Point group: D2
Chain length 116, copies 4
Amino acid sequence: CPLMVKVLDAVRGSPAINVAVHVFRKAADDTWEPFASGKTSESGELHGLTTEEEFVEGIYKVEIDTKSYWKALGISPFHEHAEVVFTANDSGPRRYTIAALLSPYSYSTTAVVTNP
Amino acid sequence: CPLMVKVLDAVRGSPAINVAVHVFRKAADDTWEPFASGKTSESGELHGLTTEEEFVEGIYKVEIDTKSYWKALGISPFHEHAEVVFTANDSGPRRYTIAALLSPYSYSTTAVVTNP
Amino acid sequence: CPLMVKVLDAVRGSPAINVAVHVFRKAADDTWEPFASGKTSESGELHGLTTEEEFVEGIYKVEIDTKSYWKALGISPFHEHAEVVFTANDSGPRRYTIAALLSPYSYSTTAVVTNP
Amino acid sequence: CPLMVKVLDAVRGSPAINVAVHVFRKAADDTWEPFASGKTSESGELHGLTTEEEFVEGIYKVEIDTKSYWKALGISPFHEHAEVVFTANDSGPRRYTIAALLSPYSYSTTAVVTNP
Protein backbone atom coordinates (compact mmCIF):
# COMPACT_ATOMS: atom_id res chain seq x y z
CA CYS A 1 0.00 0.00 0.00
CA PRO A 2 2.35 2.67 -1.21
CA LEU A 3 0.39 5.84 -0.46
CA MET A 4 -1.27 6.43 2.93
CA VAL A 5 -2.80 9.62 4.32
CA LYS A 6 -3.42 10.35 8.02
CA VAL A 7 -5.36 13.34 9.26
CA LEU A 8 -5.65 14.73 12.82
CA ASP A 9 -7.87 17.42 14.37
CA ALA A 10 -6.02 19.95 16.56
CA VAL A 11 -9.19 21.51 17.97
CA ARG A 12 -10.79 18.36 19.39
CA GLY A 13 -7.65 16.26 19.88
CA SER A 14 -8.85 13.41 17.73
CA PRO A 15 -8.41 11.69 14.43
CA ALA A 16 -10.15 13.60 11.62
CA ILE A 17 -12.70 11.03 10.51
CA ASN A 18 -14.57 10.83 7.20
CA VAL A 19 -12.34 13.47 5.60
CA ALA A 20 -12.34 13.42 1.78
CA VAL A 21 -8.96 13.14 0.11
CA HIS A 22 -8.34 13.46 -3.65
CA VAL A 23 -5.08 12.56 -5.34
CA PHE A 24 -4.17 13.92 -8.77
CA ARG A 25 -1.21 13.25 -11.08
CA LYS A 26 0.19 15.90 -13.35
CA ALA A 27 -0.55 14.96 -16.99
CA ALA A 28 1.62 15.60 -20.06
CA ASP A 29 -0.43 18.71 -20.81
CA ASP A 30 0.24 20.12 -17.25
CA THR A 31 -3.34 19.54 -16.07
CA TRP A 32 -4.13 17.56 -12.93
CA GLU A 33 -5.57 14.20 -13.78
CA PRO A 34 -7.63 12.40 -11.16
CA PHE A 35 -5.59 9.51 -9.74
CA ALA A 36 -7.27 8.12 -6.60
CA SER A 37 -9.53 9.31 -3.79
CA GLY A 38 -11.14 8.17 -0.57
CA LYS A 39 -12.21 9.12 2.94
CA THR A 40 -10.37 8.76 6.22
CA SER A 41 -11.49 6.02 8.61
CA GLU A 42 -12.29 6.21 12.34
CA SER A 43 -8.54 6.27 12.99
CA GLY A 44 -8.02 9.25 10.67
CA GLU A 45 -6.22 7.01 8.15
CA LEU A 46 -6.83 6.41 4.50
CA HIS A 47 -5.29 3.22 3.14
CA GLY A 48 -5.89 1.46 -0.17
CA LEU A 49 -5.63 4.51 -2.42
CA THR A 50 -3.36 2.79 -4.92
CA THR A 51 -1.10 -0.17 -5.75
CA GLU A 52 2.58 -0.32 -6.71
CA GLU A 53 1.60 -0.91 -10.31
CA GLU A 54 -0.85 1.98 -10.58
CA PHE A 55 1.50 4.36 -8.74
CA VAL A 56 3.89 5.37 -11.47
CA GLU A 57 6.47 8.09 -11.26
CA GLY A 58 5.19 11.62 -11.55
CA ILE A 59 4.10 14.74 -9.76
CA TYR A 60 1.23 14.08 -7.39
CA LYS A 61 -1.11 16.40 -5.56
CA VAL A 62 -2.98 15.25 -2.48
CA GLU A 63 -5.93 17.57 -1.76
CA ILE A 64 -7.62 17.18 1.62
CA ASP A 65 -11.16 18.59 2.00
CA THR A 66 -10.57 20.46 5.21
CA LYS A 67 -13.39 22.92 4.56
CA SER A 68 -16.17 20.29 4.70
CA TYR A 69 -14.65 18.94 7.92
CA TRP A 70 -14.80 22.27 9.73
CA LYS A 71 -18.23 23.13 8.32
CA ALA A 72 -19.67 19.84 9.71
CA LEU A 73 -18.41 20.95 13.11
CA GLY A 74 -19.89 24.44 12.67
CA ILE A 75 -16.43 26.01 13.00
CA SER A 76 -15.33 28.67 10.53
CA PRO A 77 -12.44 27.49 8.32
CA PHE A 78 -9.92 29.59 6.47
CA HIS A 79 -8.70 27.17 3.80
CA GLU A 80 -10.57 25.54 0.96
CA HIS A 81 -8.36 22.48 1.31
CA ALA A 82 -4.85 21.36 2.34
CA GLU A 83 -2.37 20.40 -0.34
CA VAL A 84 0.64 18.26 -0.60
CA VAL A 85 2.42 18.38 -4.00
CA PHE A 86 5.45 16.11 -4.59
CA THR A 87 7.40 14.04 -7.09
CA ALA A 88 7.00 10.31 -6.40
CA ASN A 89 8.80 7.14 -7.48
CA ASP A 90 11.34 8.81 -9.76
CA SER A 91 14.06 6.50 -8.34
CA GLY A 92 11.81 3.49 -8.23
CA PRO A 93 8.98 2.60 -5.90
CA ARG A 94 8.77 4.18 -2.48
CA ARG A 95 6.09 4.09 0.20
CA TYR A 96 4.72 7.51 1.18
CA THR A 97 2.79 8.42 4.32
CA ILE A 98 1.36 11.94 4.17
CA ALA A 99 0.22 13.27 7.57
CA ALA A 100 -1.82 16.40 8.05
CA LEU A 101 -2.75 18.25 11.25
CA LEU A 102 -5.75 20.52 10.91
CA SER A 103 -6.73 23.73 12.66
CA PRO A 104 -9.33 26.19 11.40
CA TYR A 105 -6.73 28.78 10.23
CA SER A 106 -3.62 26.56 9.93
CA TYR A 107 -2.44 23.19 8.79
CA SER A 108 0.79 21.27 9.00
CA THR A 109 1.87 18.38 6.86
CA THR A 110 4.77 15.98 6.86
CA ALA A 111 5.88 13.04 4.73
CA VAL A 112 7.45 9.78 5.77
CA VAL A 113 9.12 8.02 2.85
CA THR A 114 10.48 4.49 2.99
CA ASN A 115 12.16 2.23 0.45
CA PRO A 116 10.30 -1.16 0.47
CA CYS B 1 -1.49 46.24 1.80
CA PRO B 2 -4.11 43.55 2.20
CA LEU B 3 -2.04 40.46 1.44
CA MET B 4 1.42 39.66 2.85
CA VAL B 5 3.36 36.42 2.78
CA LYS B 6 6.07 35.47 5.28
CA VAL B 7 8.31 32.41 4.93
CA LEU B 8 10.64 30.91 7.56
CA ASP B 9 13.32 28.17 7.41
CA ALA B 10 13.11 25.58 10.21
CA VAL B 11 16.48 24.00 9.37
CA ARG B 12 18.63 27.11 9.76
CA GLY B 13 16.31 29.12 11.99
CA SER B 14 16.08 32.06 9.64
CA PRO B 15 13.89 33.93 7.28
CA ALA B 16 13.60 32.11 3.95
CA ILE B 17 15.09 34.69 1.60
CA ASN B 18 14.46 35.06 -2.14
CA VAL B 19 11.66 32.48 -2.23
CA ALA B 20 9.36 32.83 -5.27
CA VAL B 21 5.68 33.26 -4.41
CA HIS B 22 2.82 33.28 -6.91
CA VAL B 23 -0.81 34.15 -6.12
CA PHE B 24 -3.72 33.10 -8.36
CA ARG B 25 -7.45 33.91 -8.26
CA LYS B 26 -10.01 31.29 -9.27
CA ALA B 27 -11.78 32.43 -12.46
CA ALA B 28 -15.39 31.65 -13.42
CA ASP B 29 -14.24 28.73 -15.60
CA ASP B 30 -12.50 27.16 -12.52
CA THR B 31 -9.03 27.98 -13.87
CA TRP B 32 -6.39 29.76 -11.83
CA GLU B 33 -5.71 33.27 -13.15
CA PRO B 34 -2.37 34.87 -12.20
CA PHE B 35 -3.00 37.59 -9.65
CA ALA B 36 0.27 38.67 -7.97
CA SER B 37 3.81 37.42 -7.38
CA GLY B 38 7.21 38.26 -6.04
CA LYS B 39 10.21 37.04 -4.08
CA THR B 40 10.63 37.15 -0.33
CA SER B 41 12.95 39.84 1.04
CA GLU B 42 15.89 39.51 3.48
CA SER B 43 13.29 39.34 6.26
CA GLY B 44 11.44 36.45 4.58
CA GLU B 45 8.53 38.79 3.81
CA LEU B 46 6.76 39.73 0.62
CA HIS B 47 4.84 43.01 0.81
CA GLY B 48 3.13 45.02 -1.92
CA LEU B 49 1.51 42.07 -3.68
CA THR B 50 -1.80 43.77 -4.25
CA THR B 51 -3.94 46.73 -3.39
CA GLU B 52 -7.35 47.07 -1.76
CA GLU B 53 -8.93 47.91 -5.16
CA GLU B 54 -7.55 44.76 -6.80
CA PHE B 55 -8.11 42.24 -3.99
CA VAL B 56 -11.75 41.31 -4.27
CA GLU B 57 -13.58 38.46 -2.59
CA GLY B 58 -12.97 35.07 -4.16
CA ILE B 59 -10.84 31.97 -3.96
CA TYR B 60 -7.09 32.53 -4.01
CA LYS B 61 -4.13 30.14 -4.28
CA VAL B 62 -0.66 31.05 -2.98
CA GLU B 63 2.10 28.82 -4.40
CA ILE B 64 5.48 29.06 -2.63
CA ASP B 65 8.44 27.63 -4.55
CA THR B 66 9.96 25.68 -1.70
CA LYS B 67 11.81 23.20 -3.92
CA SER B 68 13.97 25.89 -5.50
CA TYR B 69 14.75 27.26 -2.05
CA TRP B 70 16.03 23.96 -0.68
CA LYS B 71 17.74 22.71 -3.82
CA ALA B 72 19.92 25.86 -3.96
CA LEU B 73 20.93 25.34 -0.33
CA GLY B 74 22.09 21.80 -1.06
CA ILE B 75 19.33 20.17 0.99
CA SER B 76 17.07 17.55 -0.59
CA PRO B 77 13.38 18.59 -0.48
CA PHE B 78 10.19 16.57 -0.64
CA HIS B 79 7.60 19.02 -2.00
CA GLU B 80 7.40 20.69 -5.38
CA HIS B 81 5.92 23.73 -3.75
CA ALA B 82 3.68 24.66 -0.91
CA GLU B 83 0.10 25.76 -1.50
CA VAL B 84 -2.35 27.84 0.41
CA VAL B 85 -5.87 27.92 -0.99
CA PHE B 86 -8.47 30.11 0.75
CA THR B 87 -11.51 32.29 0.32
CA ALA B 88 -11.04 35.99 0.86
CA ASN B 89 -14.21 37.16 2.61
CA ASP B 90 -14.83 40.85 3.23
CA SER B 91 -16.67 40.03 6.47
CA GLY B 92 -14.20 40.20 9.35
CA PRO B 93 -10.74 41.71 9.25
CA ARG B 94 -9.12 43.09 6.15
CA ARG B 95 -5.37 42.33 6.25
CA TYR B 96 -4.28 38.74 5.43
CA THR B 97 -0.83 37.51 6.44
CA ILE B 98 -0.05 34.04 5.09
CA ALA B 99 2.89 32.49 6.99
CA ALA B 100 4.77 29.36 5.97
CA LEU B 101 7.32 27.44 7.99
CA LEU B 102 9.53 25.24 5.83
CA SER B 103 11.32 21.98 6.47
CA PRO B 104 12.62 19.60 3.83
CA TYR B 105 9.82 17.03 4.35
CA SER B 106 7.24 19.21 6.08
CA TYR B 107 5.57 22.55 6.12
CA SER B 108 3.17 24.46 8.33
CA THR B 109 1.05 27.36 7.22
CA THR B 110 -1.17 29.76 9.11
CA ALA B 111 -3.30 32.77 8.29
CA VAL B 112 -3.43 35.86 10.50
CA VAL B 113 -6.32 38.11 9.51
CA THR B 114 -6.32 41.52 11.23
CA ASN B 115 -7.30 45.16 11.06
CA PRO B 116 -4.24 47.40 11.36
CA CYS C 1 -1.45 1.25 26.98
CA PRO C 2 -2.68 4.66 27.97
CA LEU C 3 0.26 6.87 27.03
CA MET C 4 1.98 6.60 23.62
CA VAL C 5 4.52 8.93 22.03
CA LYS C 6 5.30 9.14 18.30
CA VAL C 7 8.16 11.15 16.87
CA LEU C 8 8.87 12.09 13.22
CA ASP C 9 11.88 13.70 11.52
CA ALA C 10 11.03 16.56 9.13
CA VAL C 11 14.52 16.79 7.66
CA ARG C 12 14.88 13.20 6.48
CA GLY C 13 11.20 12.30 6.10
CA SER C 14 11.34 9.38 8.46
CA PRO C 15 10.36 8.16 11.87
CA ALA C 16 12.71 9.53 14.56
CA ILE C 17 14.19 6.31 15.88
CA ASN C 18 15.92 5.69 19.22
CA VAL C 19 14.78 9.06 20.60
CA ALA C 20 14.82 9.29 24.42
CA VAL C 21 11.57 10.34 26.06
CA HIS C 22 11.16 11.12 29.77
CA VAL C 23 7.82 11.55 31.48
CA PHE C 24 7.49 13.39 34.80
CA ARG C 25 4.51 13.97 37.11
CA LYS C 26 4.17 17.10 39.17
CA ALA C 27 4.57 16.22 42.87
CA ALA C 28 2.82 17.80 45.86
CA ASP C 29 5.84 20.03 46.42
CA ASP C 30 5.67 21.33 42.76
CA THR C 31 8.79 19.44 41.67
CA TRP C 32 8.79 17.09 38.69
CA GLU C 33 8.96 13.51 39.80
CA PRO C 34 10.22 10.92 37.34
CA PHE C 35 7.27 8.84 36.10
CA ALA C 36 8.31 6.73 33.08
CA SER C 37 10.80 6.84 30.23
CA GLY C 38 11.87 4.97 27.11
CA LYS C 39 13.16 5.24 23.56
CA THR C 40 11.27 5.32 20.29
CA SER C 41 11.31 2.20 18.12
CA GLU C 42 12.09 1.82 14.39
CA SER C 43 8.59 3.16 13.69
CA GLY C 44 9.19 6.29 15.79
CA GLU C 45 6.74 5.02 18.44
CA LEU C 46 7.15 4.50 22.13
CA HIS C 47 4.59 2.16 23.69
CA GLY C 48 4.58 0.54 27.12
CA LEU C 49 5.44 3.64 29.15
CA THR C 50 2.75 3.02 31.74
CA THR C 51 -0.40 1.12 32.75
CA GLU C 52 -3.89 2.34 33.67
CA GLU C 53 -3.13 1.70 37.31
CA GLU C 54 0.18 3.55 37.40
CA PHE C 55 -1.20 6.47 35.37
CA VAL C 56 -3.04 8.45 37.99
CA GLU C 57 -4.50 11.88 37.56
CA GLY C 58 -2.05 14.75 37.61
CA ILE C 59 0.05 17.15 35.62
CA TYR C 60 2.48 15.35 33.34
CA LYS C 61 5.46 16.55 31.38
CA VAL C 62 6.76 14.60 28.41
CA GLU C 63 10.33 15.67 27.57
CA ILE C 64 11.73 14.47 24.25
CA ASP C 65 15.54 14.51 23.81
CA THR C 66 15.60 16.23 20.47
CA LYS C 67 19.12 17.58 20.98
CA SER C 68 20.79 14.13 21.06
CA TYR C 69 18.85 13.19 17.93
CA TRP C 70 20.14 16.11 15.89
CA LYS C 71 23.67 15.80 17.28
CA ALA C 72 23.83 12.13 16.15
CA LEU C 73 23.01 13.36 12.66
CA GLY C 74 25.63 16.12 12.87
CA ILE C 75 22.94 18.79 12.39
CA SER C 76 22.89 21.83 14.65
CA PRO C 77 19.80 21.91 16.90
CA PHE C 78 18.20 24.89 18.56
CA HIS C 79 16.24 23.25 21.38
CA GLU C 80 17.45 21.28 24.36
CA HIS C 81 14.30 19.18 24.19
CA ALA C 82 10.61 19.30 23.19
CA GLU C 83 7.98 19.47 25.91
CA VAL C 84 4.42 18.56 26.28
CA VAL C 85 2.83 19.54 29.64
CA PHE C 86 -0.79 18.53 30.35
CA THR C 87 -3.31 17.47 32.96
CA ALA C 88 -4.27 13.80 32.54
CA ASN C 89 -7.06 11.55 33.82
CA ASP C 90 -8.81 14.18 35.95
CA SER C 91 -12.19 12.88 34.66
CA GLY C 92 -11.15 9.27 34.79
CA PRO C 93 -8.85 7.27 32.56
CA ARG C 94 -8.14 8.42 29.05
CA ARG C 95 -5.70 7.21 26.41
CA TYR C 96 -3.22 9.85 25.22
CA THR C 97 -1.13 9.79 22.04
CA ILE C 98 1.45 12.58 21.96
CA ALA C 99 2.94 13.17 18.49
CA ALA C 100 5.95 15.34 17.82
CA LEU C 101 7.43 16.51 14.51
CA LEU C 102 11.04 17.59 14.72
CA SER C 103 13.07 20.11 12.76
CA PRO C 104 16.39 21.58 13.88
CA TYR C 105 14.88 25.00 14.83
CA SER C 106 11.19 24.05 15.24
CA TYR C 107 8.92 21.41 16.61
CA SER C 108 5.21 20.74 16.49
CA THR C 109 3.21 18.57 18.81
CA THR C 110 -0.36 17.36 18.95
CA ALA C 111 -2.40 15.16 21.26
CA VAL C 112 -5.03 12.61 20.44
CA VAL C 113 -7.17 11.76 23.45
CA THR C 114 -9.70 8.94 23.55
CA ASN C 115 -12.04 7.60 26.22
CA PRO C 116 -11.50 3.78 26.46
CA CYS D 1 16.27 43.73 21.92
CA PRO D 2 17.76 40.27 21.76
CA LEU D 3 14.74 38.17 22.70
CA MET D 4 11.20 38.55 21.31
CA VAL D 5 8.24 36.22 21.58
CA LYS D 6 5.34 36.11 19.12
CA VAL D 7 2.16 34.07 19.66
CA LEU D 8 -0.57 33.31 17.12
CA ASP D 9 -4.05 31.71 17.42
CA ALA D 10 -4.80 29.03 14.82
CA VAL D 11 -8.50 28.80 15.72
CA ARG D 12 -9.42 32.43 15.08
CA GLY D 13 -6.56 33.33 12.75
CA SER D 14 -5.28 36.16 14.89
CA PRO D 15 -2.55 37.29 17.14
CA ALA D 16 -2.87 35.73 20.59
CA ILE D 17 -3.32 38.84 22.73
CA ASN D 18 -2.55 39.22 26.45
CA VAL D 19 -0.85 35.83 26.76
CA ALA D 20 1.46 35.56 29.79
CA VAL D 21 5.05 34.60 28.95
CA HIS D 22 7.77 33.78 31.48
CA VAL D 23 11.46 33.26 30.67
CA PHE D 24 13.84 31.41 33.03
CA ARG D 25 17.61 30.84 32.91
CA LYS D 26 19.09 27.57 34.14
CA ALA D 27 21.20 28.23 37.26
CA ALA D 28 24.30 26.30 38.32
CA ASP D 29 22.23 24.13 40.69
CA ASP D 30 20.01 23.06 37.71
CA THR D 31 17.07 25.14 38.95
CA TRP D 32 15.20 27.60 36.75
CA GLU D 33 15.82 31.20 37.81
CA PRO D 34 13.25 33.81 36.71
CA PHE D 35 14.77 35.95 33.98
CA ALA D 36 12.07 37.99 32.18
CA SER D 37 8.31 38.03 31.64
CA GLY D 38 5.41 39.93 30.20
CA LYS D 39 2.14 39.70 28.29
CA THR D 40 1.74 39.69 24.54
CA SER D 41 0.51 42.92 22.95
CA GLU D 42 -2.40 43.47 20.51
CA SER D 43 -0.05 42.20 17.78
CA GLY D 44 0.68 38.97 19.68
CA GLU D 45 4.23 40.18 20.32
CA LEU D 46 6.26 40.66 23.46
CA HIS D 47 9.22 43.02 23.06
CA GLY D 48 11.56 44.49 25.66
CA LEU D 49 12.05 41.29 27.65
CA THR D 50 15.76 41.75 28.14
CA THR D 51 18.80 43.69 27.10
CA GLU D 52 22.09 42.68 25.50
CA GLU D 53 23.90 43.15 28.84
CA GLU D 54 21.53 40.82 30.69
CA PHE D 55 21.12 38.08 28.07
CA VAL D 56 24.20 35.94 28.47
CA GLU D 57 24.88 32.51 27.02
CA GLY D 58 23.13 29.68 28.81
CA ILE D 59 20.04 27.53 28.80
CA TYR D 60 16.73 29.38 28.77
CA LYS D 61 13.12 28.22 29.17
CA VAL D 62 10.18 30.19 27.76
CA GLU D 63 6.83 29.20 29.30
CA ILE D 64 3.73 30.48 27.48
CA ASP D 65 0.48 30.33 29.45
CA THR D 66 -1.66 28.85 26.73
CA LYS D 67 -4.24 27.34 29.09
CA SER D 68 -5.29 30.73 30.45
CA TYR D 69 -5.58 32.04 26.90
CA TRP D 70 -7.96 29.31 25.75
CA LYS D 71 -9.97 28.98 28.95
CA ALA D 72 -10.89 32.70 28.84
CA LEU D 73 -12.06 32.31 25.25
CA GLY D 74 -14.39 29.47 26.21
CA ILE D 75 -12.41 26.83 24.32
CA SER D 76 -11.20 23.70 26.11
CA PRO D 77 -7.39 23.35 25.97
CA PHE D 78 -5.11 20.35 26.31
CA HIS D 79 -1.81 21.82 27.53
CA GLU D 80 -0.98 23.55 30.79
CA HIS D 81 1.45 25.75 28.96
CA ALA D 82 3.84 25.62 26.09
CA GLU D 83 7.59 25.43 26.65
CA VAL D 84 10.58 26.36 24.63
CA VAL D 85 13.92 25.30 26.07
CA PHE D 86 17.11 26.29 24.21
CA THR D 87 20.72 27.29 24.53
CA ALA D 88 21.59 30.86 23.71
CA ASN D 89 24.94 30.71 21.93
CA ASP D 90 26.82 33.89 21.06
CA SER D 91 28.21 32.24 17.91
CA GLY D 92 25.92 33.07 14.99
CA PRO D 93 23.22 35.71 14.93
CA ARG D 94 22.23 37.79 17.92
CA ARG D 95 18.45 38.40 17.82
CA TYR D 96 16.18 35.49 18.87
CA THR D 97 12.50 35.49 17.91
CA ILE D 98 10.56 32.63 19.49
CA ALA D 99 7.24 32.09 17.67
CA ALA D 100 4.39 29.91 18.89
CA LEU D 101 1.30 28.87 16.97
CA LEU D 102 -1.52 27.75 19.26
CA SER D 103 -4.35 25.30 18.83
CA PRO D 104 -6.37 23.73 21.61
CA TYR D 105 -4.67 20.30 21.31
CA SER D 106 -1.51 21.30 19.46
CA TYR D 107 1.23 23.82 19.21
CA SER D 108 4.13 24.59 16.90
CA THR D 109 7.15 26.64 17.83
CA THR D 110 10.04 27.96 15.80
CA ALA D 111 13.11 30.07 16.43
CA VAL D 112 14.30 32.75 14.01
CA VAL D 113 17.81 33.90 14.88
CA THR D 114 18.99 36.95 12.92
CA ASN D 115 21.20 40.02 12.85
CA PRO D 116 19.13 43.17 12.34
